[PDB]
Design an enzyme around this catalytic site. Structure first.
Site, PDB file in Angstrom:
ATOM      1  N   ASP A   1       9.086   5.514   1.860  1.00 53.31           N
ATOM      2  CA  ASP A   1       7.757   4.940   1.964  1.00 53.31           C
ATOM      3  C   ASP A   1       7.386   4.898   3.441  1.00 53.31           C
ATOM      4  OD1 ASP A   1       9.839   2.549   1.350  1.00 53.31           O
ATOM      5  OD2 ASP A   1       8.292   1.766   2.693  1.00 53.31           O
ATOM      6  N   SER A   2       6.198   4.387   3.724  1.00 53.25           N
ATOM      7  CA  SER A   2       5.645   4.432   5.066  1.00 53.25           C
ATOM      8  C   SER A   2       6.253   3.406   6.002  1.00 53.25           C
ATOM      9  CB  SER A   2       4.148   4.216   5.001  1.00 53.25           C
ATOM     10  OG  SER A   2       3.602   5.036   3.990  1.00 53.25           O
TER      11      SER A   2
END
Ligand SMILES: CCCCCCCCCCCCCCCCCC(=O)OC[C@H](COP(=O)([O-])OCC(O)COP(=O)([O-])OC[C@@H](COC(=O)CCCCCCCCCCCCCCCCC)OC(=O)CCCCCCCCCCCCCCCCC)OC(=O)CCCCCCCCCCCCCCCCC
Ligand SMILES: CCCCCCCCCCC(CCCCCCCCCC)(CO[C@H]1O[C@@H](CO)[C@H](O[C@@H]2O[C@@H](CO)[C@H](O)[C@@H](O)[C@@H]2O)[C@@H](O)[C@@H]1O)CO[C@H]1O[C@@H](CO)[C@H](O[C@@H]2O[C@@H](CO)[C@H](O)[C@@H](O)[C@@H]2O)[C@@H](O)[C@H]1O
Ligand SMILES: CCCCCCCCCCCCCCCCCC(=O)OC[C@H](COP(=O)(O)OCCN)OC(=O)CCCCCCCCCCCCCCCCC
Ligand SMILES: CCCCCCCCCCCC(=O)OC[C@H](COP(=O)(O)OCC[N+](C)(C)C)OC(=O)CCCCCCCCCCC
Lengths: 85, 106, 55, 48, 82, 90, 76
Positions: A42-43
């Site tokens: 994920d970011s």
């Protein structure tokens, strides 16, 4: 003294990534690998691994150069750009 | 103030950078620090599914304030970098030949 | 092995010769006047001091 | 002639490199000014 | 900037030592330790309070007491054996 | 019909010598800043901060150390003194 | 602009750009400048009283407000 070379940055950043667990798996790793898409991050655990890679090499990163090392290869040559080890 | 974007991503990736780095120099112990790091990792993961701009901006600005209050006097810096102790010890002089100013005398 | 070298330099530079020669000459001359004072009761340089009398 | 000497010395006898040289002032500053100043020192020391 | 702060703190103390030194050469007429300590018990106490306060501000600046401590900690930019 | 003489032969002025190559890259901002500070007085004007500074340093501080200097002229002798002895005179 | 003495020299300037004073230390260190040491680009306009906002100026602490810190110091 102690020299690094690029072999070493390679086998340290991959060592760092195989002990991280939220990667997809331990053998789709190579230098070409997007951390975004290939390794299933994920970011923000791309940010946890930017924190881990900056404590790993003993160096510090401003926010506008942490964002753009999205591949592993850009990370390797960006860490090889600095004189400190 | 913005939903799922590149700029809101820019903002809170740097905010997560900042709180990790800022928690790094409070805690001496390793596993107390990493218990705490997984704890605020949990704090970021309970959010990031908000679709409003109102309370996204309200939570955004007060976690900015909550980030502002737990600030540290000394950041941990590596010494050869601009906060550190080895910074600019022996700057190598640039290679320059001598410019001359007088016809008669060096 | 050890430290890297740089080219050879002579010891007695011109400033070493000049400053050492002048200061050693001054100390030798001071000792010469202290030599001469014990024999003759007066300095060798006050031979050359000829001011007028005060009256 | 002085012009041709010093401009050639600046851009480039011209094509050699060594250190034995006397500039125009060193004749009467090392041999007249400096012994007069040492004389002044000696006259002050023994005048004291 | 650290060497600048250290020397200007010490120079503060040096100014107060020049003051106390002027009063020493005024009151005792000398700077020698033997003459000053031979005649110290006779001198007026307000004079000696003035002298020793000026010399103590000098000593307090160099031996780094609380008004003036800022330059020791700001002298770690020099190396370890310094 | 009034022209200075035919026998002038006037020509241009030179300073003479060697043109030294430029050892210093000019900074336009530093040059403008320093030209502004050097000639600060021809754009100086009287304000309240100016008046505060002018009265404090030109009249107030001279009057203060004047009062101190005239009150304390023949006060102190510290030359040879003892315990229980005055060091002032008045 | 920001400081009171910078406000005090406002009516004396004419034909001068009236910069906002910003301390040269509180700039980012990682933005590449022409001089990394002074943290300054090559033709950047200088404030009035620029030697109070230079790198060679006082250290200008970041962590406490100055009135807060005077309260804490006189407190202790
Ligand atoms: C003892 C008594 C001594 C008396 C004084 C001796 C001076 C000697 C002068 C001399 O040597 O001639 C050369 C001198 C010019 O110097 P120069 O060498 O030609 O320089 C040109 C070149 O550039 C120089 O060459 P360069 O191109 O290579 O330049 C490089 C430059 C380097 O560049 C620099 O950066 C120089 C840095 C500054 C140096 C200047 C400060 C010098 C400080 C001296 C040390 C003090 C230390 C503190 C004391 C600690 C002691 C407790 O070189 C230097 O200048 C270095 C200077 C220091 C070298 C010293 C070497 C000494 C070696 C001695 C060894 C001892 C061996 C003894 C063995 C015994 C065995 C028994 O010409 C003169 O004669 C000057 C006149 C001398 C008289 C001066 C005035 C006297 C009277 C004053 C007036 C009276 C009071 C006022 C009255 C007013 C009216 C009432
Ligand atoms: C470019 C600069 C030029 C050079 C500057 C030096 C010029 C000299 C100036 C200083 C000046 C004040 C001037 C005030 C206006 C300032 C204007 C500034 C410039 C305007 C453009 C100080 O004089 C006064 O200073 C006062 C300030 O305190 C003092 O007043 C109080 O009392 C004290 C009791 O002890 C207290 O201690 C103190 O606390 C008090 O306050 C007094 O000490 C004193 O009277 C001038 O006065 C001078 O005047 C002459 C009289 O001609 C005086 O000598 C006289 O001579 C005969 C003549 O008639 C007299 O027959 C004779 O009796 C007398 O002896 C001088 O001796 C001198 O006094
Ligand atoms: C009564 C006795 C007992 C008293 C006990 C309590 C004493 C409290 C007062 C102490 C005063 C100490 C002396 C003050 C001068 C010290 C100057 C100094 O230290 O300069 C430091 C400053 C750099 O400091 P900084 O940048 O913060 O640190 C660098 C390290 N990274 O360097 C610079 O920035 C250079 C430019 C500024 C230099 C200073 C200029 C202003 C100095 C004003 C001092 C005025 C003193 C006289 C005042 C009366 C005048 C009539
Ligand atoms: C007087 C007590 C003042 C308290 C100030 C303070 O907060 O003290 C705290 C220090 C912390 O020091 P630390 O754990 O080594 O590192 C830094 C760890 N932080 C960053 C989390 C704080 O603990 C001490 O030294 C107190 C023990 C000595 C008290 C007397 C016995």
């Amino acid at each position: 003294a102690h020299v690094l070379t690029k072999d070493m940055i390679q086998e340290r950043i991959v060592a760092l990534l195989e002990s991280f667990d939220k990667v997809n798996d331990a053998k789709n790793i190579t230098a070409t690998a997007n951390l975004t898409s290939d390794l299933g991050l994920d970011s923000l655990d791309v940010v946890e691994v930017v924190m881990a890679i900056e404590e790993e090499f003993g160096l510090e990163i401003p926010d506008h150069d942490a964002d753009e090392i999205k591949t592993v290869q850009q990370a390797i040559d960006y860490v090889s750009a600095q004189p400190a080890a | 103030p913005v939903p799922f974007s590149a700029a809101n991503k820019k903002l809170v990736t740097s905010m997560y950078r900042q709180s990790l780095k800022l928690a790094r120099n409070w805690i001496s112990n390793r596993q107390l620090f990493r218990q705490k790091a997984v704890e605020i990792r949990h704090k970021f993961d309970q959010n990031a599914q908000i679709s409003n701009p109102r309370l996204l901006a309200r939570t955004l600005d007060e976690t900015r304030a909550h980030l502002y209050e737990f600030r540290h006097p000394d950041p941990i810096v590596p010494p050869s970098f601009p906060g550190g102790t080895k910074y600019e010890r022996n700057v190598p002089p640039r290679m320059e030949k001598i410019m001359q100013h007088n016809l008669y005398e060096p | 092995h050890g430290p890297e070298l740089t080219p050879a330099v002579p010891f007695f530079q011109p400033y070493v010769l000049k400053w050492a020669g002048v200061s050693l000459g001054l100390v030798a001359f001071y000792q010469f006047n202290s030599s001469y004072e014990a024999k003759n009761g007066h300095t060798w340089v006050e031979t050359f001091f000829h001011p007028k009398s005060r009256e | 002639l002085k012009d041709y000497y010093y401009n050639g010395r600046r851009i480039l006898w011209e094509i050699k490199r060594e250190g034995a040289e006397k500039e125009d002032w060193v004749n009467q500053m090392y041999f007249l000014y400096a012994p007069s100043l040492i004389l002044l020192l000696i006259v002050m020391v023994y005048k004291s | 900037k650290s060497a600048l702060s250290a020397v200007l703190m010490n120079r503060f103390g040096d100014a107060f030592f020049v003051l106390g030194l002027c009063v020493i050469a005024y009151v005792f007429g000398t700077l020698n330790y033997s003459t000053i300590f031979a005649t110290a018990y006779l001198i007026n106490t307000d004079l000696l309070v003035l002298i020793m306060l000026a010399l103590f501000i000098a000593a307090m600046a160099k031996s780094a007491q609380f008004g003036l401590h800022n330059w020791l900690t700001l002298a770690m930019e020099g190396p370890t054996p310094v | 019909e009034l022209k200075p003489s035919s026998a002038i032969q006037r020509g241009p002025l030179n300073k003479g010598g060697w043109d030294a190559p430029h050892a210093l890259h000019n900074d336009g901002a530093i040059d403008r800043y320093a030209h502004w500070r050097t000639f600060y007085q021809e754009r100086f004007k009287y304000t309240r901060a100016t008046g505060k500074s002018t009265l404090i340093f030109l009249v107030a501080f001279p009057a203060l150390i004047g009062y101190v200097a005239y009150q304390s002229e023949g006060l102190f002798e510290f030359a040879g003194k003892r315990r229980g002895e005055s060091v002032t005179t008045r | 602009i920001r400081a009171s003495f910078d406000k005090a020299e406002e009516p004396m300037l004419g034909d001068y750009p009236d910069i906002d004073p910003f301390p040269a230390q509180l700039k980012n260190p990682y933005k590449k400048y022409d001089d990394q040491q002074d943290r300054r680009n090559l033709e950047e306009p200088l404030s009035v009283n620029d030697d109070l906002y230079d790198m060679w100026s006082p250290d200008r602490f970041t962590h406490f407000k100055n009135q807060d810190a005077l309260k804490y110091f006189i407190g202790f």
